[PDB]
């Protein structure tokens, strides 16, 4: 029956990389096709429309061409930015001619764009709770964008996804992940082992 | 400016219970009005498009049953009944039937479903101070904030420096973690990083607050568990710059 | 092939 | 030579009836080939020529749903036109919508049409550019404004330049 298929759940790119998100649909007639974008913490919003075979829609440097022969509407951008990070939804307008209002949305595709970090300096610092106590955390920070952070093997030691902050005033970006547990045998030195660390990292005393 | 108002913004819903949603159209250029769900897998599904005052329609999807009513030229209602799984409901509007004219999405009603009302806990918040090693190595200082032991998973974390909300130097986890990831009704944690120049951190006059808004019980829920009724509240933790 | 249900009202 | 496809959709609101008479009549080269009559029992689109006996059951199902929905559009817009021309209810008024396409020998589009007429007098029409509207009068201006703002010309042009021309081509193959 009528359908929309987006081939990808998630796509990870660096800034200025080439992006394609695949959209295929199944509908007879002359449906309009659409792209919608949901920036993080926001509602979905219109990107563009195409209503005819071979029509290119575009907005914000993105395009897709209506291809009735391949029932395709693949979203592309030559050069992505960090600000493109979002979920992109392909939508099929109602094709029966009954114009009921139904949009049929693909599953969505999560696009994460990683910055190019110019002067990497990976390290793992210990931070102490401000409210005294013997509570502490581990900061894995300053590692390049192509490093990845996997969970623990232990389930009592919690570990968070990488995260990019931007210090706007000094045009500087840095990745970081945080790791913390209560196991008493917890160690900052031995806490991202279950992760492919650089060899280059710092590990102070 | 804003085309649509939705109420409520959010609502904690005991399993099986019903909730009333309303949507107000601020501009009659866009008189066609729709409901869409977003489930927890982020899937968008059309529920209804209703144009005329008096149009009433009914649908059943996994997780919720719905009665949608176009009440006036400017008011759309949705009753969500027999709720078994959380979702967000977006009102939308359009200048057209919607085969062609785009949809403008309103701000959304977030519905959270919990089996049991005594799995509701506020977060505990803690702020961890920059490592001296980081200040030596980089001339930068990173604070880390943790909210732990909260349920359900709906918080908003902000950083406040000298009484001013900041965005620069901040990275908050996109999603909470389940502390007991098995336990289907596990409590959550959340991390955030605020990073300043070592100079800013070193100044003892600079105050750093991690503020966690938690979405919980109303003053119109019953509660008898001895431990504090876990209401919608703000929990903060603070650090002061050290010369050290 | 008749037209689809009209997208817009007068 | 050249060829045409033309549909004429009419709604007439009636005195003591209130449910309007809806009709749709398709022509190719000025010969009637399909008709829908809302005053029929369980009404459907029906072929009026032998060369329309092979479109297949789901064509007739699909455009029969379109008629039912198009009936809702004519009745809403008849009662809007009462407001715009400050006339009263339980009147006899007619809305006519004429549309379709002319093609040359080569099957390429020469001309498109989207014309609306209220009570025999024309109301708003799409110009030959398929991009701008001619409004007869002050009531039609309201409509022209809403439709310029919502890009209705582009919307109709997609039918006029795609589906209309392609279907006129197939109908001319069917009925040699």
């Amino acid at each position: 029956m009528d359908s929309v298929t987006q081939t990808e759940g998630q796509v990870a790119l660096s800034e200025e990389d080439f992006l394609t998100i695949h959209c295929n649909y199944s509908a007879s007639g002359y449906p309009a096709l659409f792209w919608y974008v949901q920036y993080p913490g926001e509602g979905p919003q219109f990107l563009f429309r195409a209503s005819r075979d071979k029509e290119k829609g575009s907005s914000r440097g993105f395009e897709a061409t209506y291809n009735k022969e391949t029932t395709s509407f693949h979203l592309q951008k030559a050069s992505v930015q960090e600000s493109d990070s979002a979920v992109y939804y392909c939508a099929l307008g109602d094709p029966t001619g009954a114009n009921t209002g139904k949009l049929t949305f693909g599953h969505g595709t999560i696009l994460r764009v990683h910055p190019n970090i110019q002067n990497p300096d990976p390290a793992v610092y210990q931070l102490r709770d401000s409210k005294s106590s013997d509570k502490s955390v581990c900061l894995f920070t300053d590692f390049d964008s192509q490093t990845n952070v996997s969970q623990s093997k232990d389930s009592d030691v919690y570990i968070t996804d990488k995260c990019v902050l931007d210090m706007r005033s000094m045009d500087f970006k840095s990745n970081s992940a945080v790791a913390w547990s209560n196991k008493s045998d917890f160690a900052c030195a031995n806490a991202f082992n279950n992760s492919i660390i650089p060899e280059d990292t710092f590990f102070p005393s | 400016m804003t085309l649509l108002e939705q109420n409520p913004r959010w609502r904690l819903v005991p399993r099986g219970q019903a909730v009333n949603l309303r949507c107000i159209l601020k501009n009659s250029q866009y008189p066609w009005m729709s409901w869409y769900q977003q489930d927890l897998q982020k899937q968008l599904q059309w529920l209804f498009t209703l144009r005329s005052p008096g149009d009433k329609e009914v649908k059943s999807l996994p997780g919720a049953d719905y009665l949608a009513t176009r009440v006036t030229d400017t008011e759309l209602r949705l009753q969500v009944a027999n709720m078994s799984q959380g979702r967000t409901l977006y009102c939308t509007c359009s200048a057209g039937r919607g085969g062609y004219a785009e949809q403008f999405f309103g701000p959304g009603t977030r519905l959270t479903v919990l089996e049991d009302l005594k799995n509701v806990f506020p977060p505990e918040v803690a702020v961890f101070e920059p490592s001296e090693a980081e200040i030596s190595h980089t001339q930068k200082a990173t604070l880390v904030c943790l909210a732990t032991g909260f349920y359900p998973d709906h918080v908003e974390l902000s950083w406040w420096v000298n009484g001013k909300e900041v965005h620069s130097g901040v990275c908050t986890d996109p999603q909470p973690l389940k502390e007991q990831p098995a336990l289907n009704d596990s409590r959550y944690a959340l991390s955030s990083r605020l990073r300043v120049s070592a100079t800013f951190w070193q100044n003892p006059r600079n105050h750093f607050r991690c503020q966690v808004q938690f979405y919980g019980l109303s003053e119109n829920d019953e509660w008898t568990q001895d431990r504090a009724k876990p209401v919608t509240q703000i929990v903060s933790a603070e650090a002061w710059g050290r010369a050290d | 092939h008749p037209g689809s249900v009209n997208e817009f009202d007068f | 030579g050249p060829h045409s496809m033309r549909y004429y959709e009419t709604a007439t609101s009636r005195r003591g009836l209130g449910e309007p008479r809806y009709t749709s009549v398709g022509y190719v080269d000025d010969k009637e080939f399909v008709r829908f009559d809302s005053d029929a029992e369980n009404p459907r689109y029906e072929p009026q020529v032998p060369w329309m006996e092979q479109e297949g059951p789901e064509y007739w199902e699909r455009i029969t749903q379109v008629a039912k929905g198009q009936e809702q559009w004519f009745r809403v817009n008849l009662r809007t036109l009462l407001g715009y021309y400050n006339q009263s209810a339980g009147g006899t008024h007619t809305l006519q919508w004429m549309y379709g396409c002319d093609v040359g020998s080569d099957g390429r589009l020469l001309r498109g049409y989207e014309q609306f007429a209220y009570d025999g007098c024309d109301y708003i029409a799409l110009n030959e550019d398929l991009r701008t509207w001619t409004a007869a009068d002050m009531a039609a201006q309201i409509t022209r404004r809403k439709w310029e703002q919502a890009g209705a010309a582009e919307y109709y042009r997609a039918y006029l330049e795609g589906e209309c021309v392609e279907w006129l081509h197939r109908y001319l193959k069917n009925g040699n």
Side-chain angles (χ1 to χ4, degrees):
Chain A
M1 90 268 311
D2 282 0
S3 85
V4 172
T5 309
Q6 278 181 245
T7 254
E8 309 90 358
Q10 43 286 299
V11 178
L13 291 180
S14 322
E15 195 153 66
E16 298 186 346
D17 278 10
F18 167 36
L19 173 68
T20 310
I21 306 166
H22 295 96
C23 184
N24 284 104
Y25 66 88
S26 165
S28 64
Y30 296 88
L33 293 187
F34 307 85
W35 277 95
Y36 283 73
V37 54
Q38 175 164 223
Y39 302 102
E42 288 182 30
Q45 63 177 295
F46 180 60
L47 198 58
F48 58 77
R49 163 214 280 109
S51 27
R52 281 258 288 305
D53 205 9
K54 312 235 152 316
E55 177 179 349
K56 162 172 346 198
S58 54
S59 177
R60 301 179 151 103
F62 292 90
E63 65 181 83
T65 308
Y66 196 132
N67 199 311
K68 201 161 163 159
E69 198 189 14
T70 75
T71 57
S72 284
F73 192 53
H74 306 314
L75 178 78
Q76 290 192 303
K77 187 176 191 184
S79 195
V80 298
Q81 307 149 53
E82 203 171 338
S83 63
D84 296 324
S85 295
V87 187
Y88 299 74
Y89 294 102
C90 190
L92 175 82
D94 170 323
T96 65
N99 206 351
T100 62
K102 169 164 51 159
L103 292 172
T104 303
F105 272 110
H107 161 100
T109 296
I110 310 166
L111 170 74
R112 282 169 206 103
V113 188
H114 313 322
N116 297 319
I117 61 149
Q118 222 68 202
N119 317 287
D121 191 354
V124 174
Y125 310 107
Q126 198 164 48
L127 290 78
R128 159 248 184 65
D129 172 346
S130 89
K131 255 252 215 222
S132 72
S133 317
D134 305 62
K135 303 214 327 188
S136 110
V137 296
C138 297
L139 178 55
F140 181 32
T141 175
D142 290 348
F143 56 80
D144 90 288
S145 275
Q146 242 69 65
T147 307
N148 283 278
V149 197
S150 42
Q151 312 273 39
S152 167
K153 280 266 172 166
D154 191 334
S155 202
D156 265 307
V157 326
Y158 318 100
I159 157 71
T160 74
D161 208 342
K162 93 179 95 175
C163 200
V164 68
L165 63 92
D166 180 11
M167 293 172 69
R168 315 233 207 295
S169 96
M170 24 186 22
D171 179 27
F172 168 103
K173 319 205 171 179
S174 64
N175 303 130
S176 61
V178 186
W180 92 87
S181 111
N182 337 229
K183 226 76 252 77
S184 114
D185 101 285
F186 186 54
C188 268
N190 224 161
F192 301 88
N193 42 297
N194 337 67
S195 267
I196 301 300
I197 324 137
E199 322 160 61
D200 227 346
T201 59
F202 186 44
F203 269 92
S205 308
Chain B
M1 38 108 233
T2 229
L3 291 181
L4 299 169
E5 304 178 285
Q6 267 180 263
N7 48 278
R9 262 293 147 279
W10 73 279
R11 184 61 54 70
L12 211 151
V13 182
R15 188 166 326 122
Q17 218 215 62
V19 61
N20 286 105
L21 273 52
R22 183 184 61 173
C23 175
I24 300 297
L25 177 63
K26 295 310 306 169
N27 187 330
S28 282
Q29 212 216 133
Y30 307 99
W32 290 84
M33 304 186 56
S34 303
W35 290 111
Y36 285 82
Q37 51 171 52
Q38 193 161 215
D39 63 19
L40 296 177
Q41 283 58 252
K42 310 169 292 95
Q43 305 303 107
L44 280 163
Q45 190 156 346
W46 168 86
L47 294 187
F48 309 104
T49 291
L50 290 186
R51 177 63 259 255
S52 303
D55 287 341
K56 248 175 191 251
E57 294 185 10
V58 112
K59 225 186 206 65
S60 188
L61 292 61
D65 304 312
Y66 302 102
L67 171 58
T69 320
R70 188 57 177 275
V71 184
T72 69
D73 286 333
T74 47
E75 189 186 342
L76 183 64
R77 294 218 199 112
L78 185 62
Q79 194 184 137
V80 4
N82 308 129
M83 269 205 79
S84 87
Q85 302 165 316
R87 58 210 48 231
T88 299
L89 280 303
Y90 291 104
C91 177
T92 71
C93 62
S94 179
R97 283 202 170 60
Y100 181 98
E102 67 256 44
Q103 300 294 321
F104 298 86
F105 280 70
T109 299
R110 190 178 168 167
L111 300 187
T112 306
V113 175
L114 73 196
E115 191 172 296
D116 200 334
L117 232 68
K118 74 185 199 283
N119 291 289
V120 192
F121 312 92
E124 286 163 20
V125 185
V127 174
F128 299 85
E129 318 206 348
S131 165
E132 216 66 46
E134 166 189 19
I135 289 151
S136 291
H137 200 93
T138 60
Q139 276 303 290
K140 287 163 180 81
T142 303
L143 296 91
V144 169
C145 181
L146 297 179
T148 64
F150 61 88
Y151 187 96
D153 62 331
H154 184 26
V155 301
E156 283 163 75
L157 188 152
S158 52
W159 286 101
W160 294 82
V161 168
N162 295 324
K164 281 173 293 297
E165 179 160 19
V166 295
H167 294 290
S168 192
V170 177
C171 199
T172 307
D173 304 327
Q175 291 311 349
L177 338 173
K178 304 219 268 148
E179 282 175 311
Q180 322 269 10
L183 270 60
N184 129 75
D185 86 312
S186 164
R187 304 155 169 249
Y188 299 86
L190 186 65
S191 85
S192 186
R193 303 154 202 74
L194 157 69
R195 181 179 225 193
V196 299
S197 63
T199 272
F200 197 78
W201 164 259
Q202 263 158 8
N203 177 163
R205 210 163 44 249
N206 290 329
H207 188 35
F208 306 86
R209 177 164 56 89
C210 178
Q211 187 169 311
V212 174
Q213 170 73 73
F214 161 84
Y215 294 93
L217 304 160
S218 342
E219 256 148 85
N220 306 47
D221 304 56
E222 183 60 339
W223 179 264
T224 54
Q225 290 280 335
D226 233 271
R227 103 179 173 285
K229 186 184 167 188
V231 295
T232 300
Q233 61 192 277
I234 289 169
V235 184
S236 303
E238 282 158 23
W240 284 94
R242 285 190 225 172
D244 279 53
Chain C
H1 267 217
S4 281
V5 181
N6 265 142
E7 181 78 6
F8 304 99
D9 289 319
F10 283 173
Chain D
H3 301 276
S4 69
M5 189 171 63
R6 204 105 335 133
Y7 286 86
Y8 290 79
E9 299 195 31
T10 316
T12 294
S13 52
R14 282 177 293 201
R15 290 276 151 196
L17 284 311
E19 189 82 89
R21 175 159 138 89
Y22 172 74
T23 61
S24 178
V25 198
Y27 298 77
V28 347
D29 293 349
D30 294 292
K31 322 206 99 140
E32 168 169 353
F33 77 104
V34 283
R35 188 179 284 266
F36 185 102
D37 181 4
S38 76
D39 293 335
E41 159 199 3
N42 190 236
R44 307 177 62 73
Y45 269 103
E46 293 289 349
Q48 300 308 130
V49 285
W51 53 258
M52 277 303 271
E53 304 274 53
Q54 308 270 32
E55 287 333 274
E58 290 173 1
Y59 174 68
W60 302 100
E61 303 162 354
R62 175 231 131 216
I63 64 162
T64 290
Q65 290 298 119
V66 169
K68 281 161 149 81
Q70 205 75 85
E71 272 184 280
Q72 259 327 99
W73 184 91
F74 273 88
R75 92 200 206 103
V76 160
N77 288 277
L78 271 170
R79 104 199 161 199
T80 305
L81 283 176
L82 285 178
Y84 281 15
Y85 285 103
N86 219 61
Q87 303 157 326
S88 68
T92 305
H93 300 114
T94 293
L95 226 201
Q96 208 203 243
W97 177 36
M98 192 220 58
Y99 61 89
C101 47
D102 304 331
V103 297
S105 268
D106 71 351
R108 298 198 179 79
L109 177 74
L110 295 165
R111 185 173 182 189
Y113 306 83
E114 294 294 347
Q115 330 214 124
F116 299 89
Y118 186 58
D119 297 335
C121 306
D122 39 80
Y123 174 80
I124 194 179
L126 191 64
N127 305 317
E128 305 211 334
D129 61 6
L130 303 191
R131 284 176 174 73
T132 63
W133 305 92
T134 297
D137 67 29
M138 287 289 94
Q141 291 296 343
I142 299 159
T143 294
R144 182 210 272 165
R145 228 161 279 148
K146 260 211 285 207
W147 287 16
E148 275 143 355
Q149 202 158 227
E154 193 179 332
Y155 155 76
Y156 284 108
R157 183 167 78 247
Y159 167 87
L160 259 16
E161 287 180 357
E163 172 173 14
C164 193
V165 164
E166 297 169 26
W167 281 82
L168 177 44
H169 204 256
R170 283 175 258 236
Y171 292 146
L172 297 163
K173 301 202 152 158
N174 287 4
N176 288 350

